[model samples]
Target: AASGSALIFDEEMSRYKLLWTDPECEIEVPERLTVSYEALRTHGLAQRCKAVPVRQATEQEILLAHSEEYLEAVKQTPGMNVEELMAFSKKYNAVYFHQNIYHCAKLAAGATLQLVDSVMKREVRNGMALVRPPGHHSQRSAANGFCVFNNVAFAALYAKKNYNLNRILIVDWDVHHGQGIQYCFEEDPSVLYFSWHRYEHQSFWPNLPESDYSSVGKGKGSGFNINLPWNKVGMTNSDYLAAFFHVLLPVAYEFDPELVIVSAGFDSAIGDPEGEMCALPEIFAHLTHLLMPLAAGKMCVVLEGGFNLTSLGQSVCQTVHSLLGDPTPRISGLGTACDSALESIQNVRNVQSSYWSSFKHLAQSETNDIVWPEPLKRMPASVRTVVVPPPGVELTLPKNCQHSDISESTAKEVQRIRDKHFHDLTDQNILRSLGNIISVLDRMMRSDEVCNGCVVVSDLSVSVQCALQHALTEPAERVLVVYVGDGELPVKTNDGKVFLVQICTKETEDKCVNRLTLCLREGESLTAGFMQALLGLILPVAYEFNPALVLGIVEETLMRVWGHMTCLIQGLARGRMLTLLQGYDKDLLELTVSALSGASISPLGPLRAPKPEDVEMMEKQRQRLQERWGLLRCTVSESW
Candidate 1:
């Protein structure tokens, strides 16, 4: 008979309570399993069973596979507490566990060994052991993916030692690159290993280079290890079936082992959080049916890895039913039926046919049968390219995003790159170059109409109060605030009005206004460096306001006269700084001066800033003024 015998071995399979406590893992695994399990249970073929819990392995049993030092490291991890363990595991992308991991390992190993003993003694024709913390991915020392010791490896070793079997077939069906097991048996020939998993061209996590099909092992095991790594997503039942019908069957038929052991990881099944493939639960049953015929009904499958619980349970049940000679059930309602899997199918056929020429039943024409839908189109900001202007350029219009690191090294590199690429552009005449780039972007967004955005360029002394007064009277929908000056104050704008202001010092503001007033009346030429300083002051305000239109007003002589403003202000003014300044009254000159200088001006020489006690007195005076103005009031009343 070609049918396989299935024995359902149920071992305790609780997802680590604390591990699933992470929001991401818990949400993904449960929902993925729920969708698949509900469908399987509705089909009425699979049944859930109570997990048989057992004690973890002792030190001696651990020593069976691991070195004493490694065991001791696990036992006496140098001051590594729970947080450290979790952090270390995440750092290495390995599984984290409590001190009781030894106990858990013993139970997993014992259950697997029990299944092996049953199969070897021919107690039942074949059995599928369903356990937790998948074992196949575990190695001699490292315990990753909730797996402790190599359960399947232990069972195989136990079979070799106890039953004196030489030729054994280890079929790993987990989706992750089983680097641990692959590393374990790279040089061994007696154990024939075959696996298929999501390769994703190294896009997926924990990518192992050796998982490639070209890596057929070294020494005598050169041709014995068979690997079929899948490149795309959504491998349905028939897709997996195609792999077996074409690639695996020919090899398995040739090997003809007396014992066929499956490292049965259901994580490859549909709705698996770990695996990208979406093969149905019954697919395992069909695969099991195919394998049973070759081993003469001597099939022993120990669970290695399966994350989604419902998928794990149902997939195991399907394998059990198939082993019991029941007809393989059909899985329905697939995701996007893309031709990607067929491409993988064709790839497998083309690659494996060199070895297994007799393999058949694949369509010669390739199809793009991908199950997951294609991603959405790129957004405007993400797709559109932004050209960063060279340093000393007067940005005529505000950029959508700007990242400038103005460190000394960065400034030199910036100058060098600008000189190399934008040689025709100069510190004096660079504004038009930046404006050209912005104009290109603006044309794309159809922003030339200047309906809402405004660009402002001016000498350092220009007051934003004047600009806000203009914006308030304007018919446009949005106001773009651009303040230009050397060490000019930051302006706060709200509802098309100036709300707050900032400056290095009140004296600097007076000097700036004096310079501007003098330039205007005396009709003297201003420096280009001064114009650039003005531009610098305006650029950040424009960026923050992000206005609909812009205005550039400067002494044309200044625009052409100076080099880069070497003494321009550095550091972005915080929004909080703007807010704190905005909390002041708009008309009070003394308060405004106090806000800027943190105290009243010294009525003495140079109008020096007030002292700390003067600032405190000013605060009190300002509070009294606010009360007199009825801007704020203190009220004590009973609750209504």
Candidate 2:
């Protein structure tokens, strides 16, 4: 029977309330389910759609998508609580079994098979199965997240068995990486799985290193499993459209599948807490609109992971409307919108450049050479740029370094020789002096156990603030005090009694504020290190504070310098300074100059703050500085 566009609005869906409810536990039963169902009712489609009974998949039907051994494991598995299911899932990689899961899986599988049957018999050209406990992430051997069986996989497999179909396409549009689907077809050629997922490289969850675009299928499936994993954050509406034009459409056209299935993960829409993607709810409709014309309108969309109630319902509703040939809706409340569209376009060009040469000639009569879609104009700016080199901070050779013929030196050797022979070093000396200071820092770090005094450092600009935060988090008992400064790298030495230093230089003051937004939003790790480096230099100058725990923050590049200073101060305060100074060929004048101007940078605020898009720009600059000079040991914070 060919079923028309029938919405299986399950009112009893709320009755199957997820018994698992520890909010602190990571595997919280998604509360969004109730809200999503409520939205469907509010749309007035609750009574219009047929209320399909939730049915369990038969053992033989499940065998279509899974091995008998895998089937036996899931059937015999026993778990009801979220923690128990989680442990079971961990063993199986990705399967969260629920109490009614077997029945749930069967219903999902049956509903899907029924949809395919309807399409084949001309009952309906397209359909959507809304019964949840999303199953796209499930595999043959195990159930995950209330998914007992691979519903769509089984349904597709059943169709192939009964209908004798050879070619099938599975498109996953979920925010999280679809590892289960990829695993199922990573070796199969008959099924082409195209997915676009959030790829913060290793930052995102369930990060499969194997999902890069270069990961073509194995054996006969060699170009079938097309993956467009996104490395950048903040995917917007245009990004999805761009993916259709760039990566998905061309591949689908080439594959020419007889049937298409969508792993509909609406978490990509705005306001999904688990996903960083910012696609609009209506984007799903637009995507479906584009895909419908390809598979001759024979498309089956199955739900996956969408936890946000409003976006998920709206996105699903829009998708249904689009399937009915309705117009797309508007999407608002976007966050840090990324230009995924441009990246998608660039990816398509890169992957299919050679194959597209024949088609390029057809564009010869175009007004503009760039035939990019109009909506994709702002896509190039989507990439987050991390300024690698701060502007105007030129790296110059030391005063005494005049190499006439040094082309043959290896990078390591050149660096070593430069460290030993180069004269008039600034930052390099700051780093070395920091080494001496840390020996004292070690003792000061332990001072709370032995002494009774509080040590605080103040007047730090943002850079110093970063440094102090890093130092304070160390295994130390000393109370560290930090103060923000007003545009100066100043130090007041009270004749060996007390030392006060200011770290807000014109070079770095504004740089911190400009890049603060991204650093705070994305929780970048480098920000912690940037804080520690400044504090290391500032702590040592405070000799009179006699602080058992010296806390100082500043914007210097040497965080390790603070550790050295801590040790030195502890030794000097405890009358061990003479022993440490025995063989010191101290250059007091040079030390004074180094302290005054060593870490100072040109007033190059122009090149200071990272561009909003530059994500790794700061790290590159730091590496270059280390390479040109020597290895500067900054304090490494233990924040991941």
Candidate 3:
């Protein structure tokens, strides 16, 4: 199911620039498209993708989300005199008029549809269309905020009408409110729209009372529309991630959208004059990766807003790289959400709490000069998943992944490493597993072509220790040990090289800041109930841990739930996971492989609330650790 990434762009869309200079609208320029596409090509991402041709959107297609009268009014722009264009532009807010604007607007909407067609037809896995004359602010009958047409809104209507998709999710991460999207879908139940914009008490552009968190959809569409207002400037990477973990992701998992589209705007990135945000360029990659797991990876990203050429270019490349299935960039300096962001987060959580079971987990900013490292370089292994079949088990190797045949030399190397620290001799079968572990780690360290690996070891405990020892052999190497089920690994938090967290049915008495345990209710299979801990707890800790590599373990009984987990956590540690299995479960192996390969998979069933006990248990667990991992702090403290 792993396929190519579609890059939909036609330079013709950039032909229309501001005809007459309006001080507030000049930043929306032609170079925004050029820089984004050039950055994709420069990073070797453009050629790697399926370059789909852009087509003009038919008038009927435009009518899917726009009014006919509004279309006719904009259609007259090409032949209008300069005075007529300026006079027409005066009717709208912060929008400019140009003779060529009509053509480019249609092309931009068409480029967006080209991306939608490619993803729906399975020509690509997920893609992004670099468009200009940005949409998201265009209303049903009026154009506002420099937008002439609502590209993503049209996609939602098109997919609903054509594909008969009952659920479509539109995420607007731009700095400004996508009021057009809200207005179009406010009464429609089939489309779920989530946007987090810069709303300083309705003082920003497109200022409207409905943009506040309280305006959650209308009547039948009540819960579908989600808005998170950023009340302050200069929100950071941590703030954006907190929104996803605490607000977006939980409900998204519940909405279970059939088609996912993004109103991707990079002005939220640091160094952008419009957004006044401090989030780094690579934060875009994390956001893209987080949403890929849903809708079976059916996603389209249509560009909306981005001004800073450098930030826009870098942010665009990061998005395409993640769509290309590269390892996610490392994000450091993550902390708790700022006060203003939390105020918004808490407000939305409270308002939408009844609409979603995922929202039942609701336990819940300042400007700064942001300087950060560039997005990390990726060494994507030629192979997506490398697995070693358990002995005596006939494993059906998944597509896009290979079965590892451990080399004899690696066996010898494993022995040499074992001879010093390992106390006693083990059987050849166990030795085979040890050699396979060493082999996978060696390949991963060299960036040879193994993004993630899974091994069915005869002895889970020793293999984990073996993998850990070799993984930390380099002094700079760090590992995130994520263990599931009742099994214990050779655990030591004394070494700064590893941050170990265990998820099981019982809590360990030993509590260290470096090593912690999250105990969910006992179950035959890991149920949707585990999502509360997974999203609200685990994800925050791992993202802040910022490990160079990930070491994972799952006891056989808990195997059923990871189809979604593997996809989300891979965003951490550059999509690297060396998972150890206690049993050779074919279904489990295939699930992990497909997730690692970036293939399409089904969304989980309804996100269920945890048992009352489990919820109470985790609330306390979170309150204790919130001080250590700020991303986990959802609610504001009662006292100073």
For residues 140-196, what per-residue lDDT tens digits would candidate 3 score against the true structure? Answer: 899999899999998888888878899999999999889999999999989999999
Model 2 C-alpha lDDT per residue in residues 293-355, reported as the tens digit of each score: 444557777777786666777777677765543323322232111344444444534554333
Ranking by lDDT: 3, 2, 1
Error of 3 at 435 (Å): 1.3
Candidate 1, residue 28: lDDT: 27
Model 1, runs deviating above 4 Å = 1-15, 19-65, 75-81, 87-91, 330-640
TM-score of each: 0.49, 0.51, 0.95
The per-residue C-alpha lDDT of model 2 at residue 463 equals 26
Q: Candidate 1 lDDT, tens digit per residue, 29-77?
A: 3232233334334544334222233445556655656667656756643
- Flag regions of model 2 displaced more than 4 Å: 1-3, 9-33, 46-54, 77-90, 93-95, 144-147, 330-349, 352-640
Instruction: Supply candidate 3's per-residue lDDT for 12.
Output: 91
- What is the lDDT for 485 in model 3? 71
Candidate that scores best on lDDT? 3
Q: Is candidate 1 or candidate 3 better by lDDT?
A: 3
Shift in Å, residue 146, candidate 1: 3.0
**Candidate 1, residue 408: lDDT:** 50
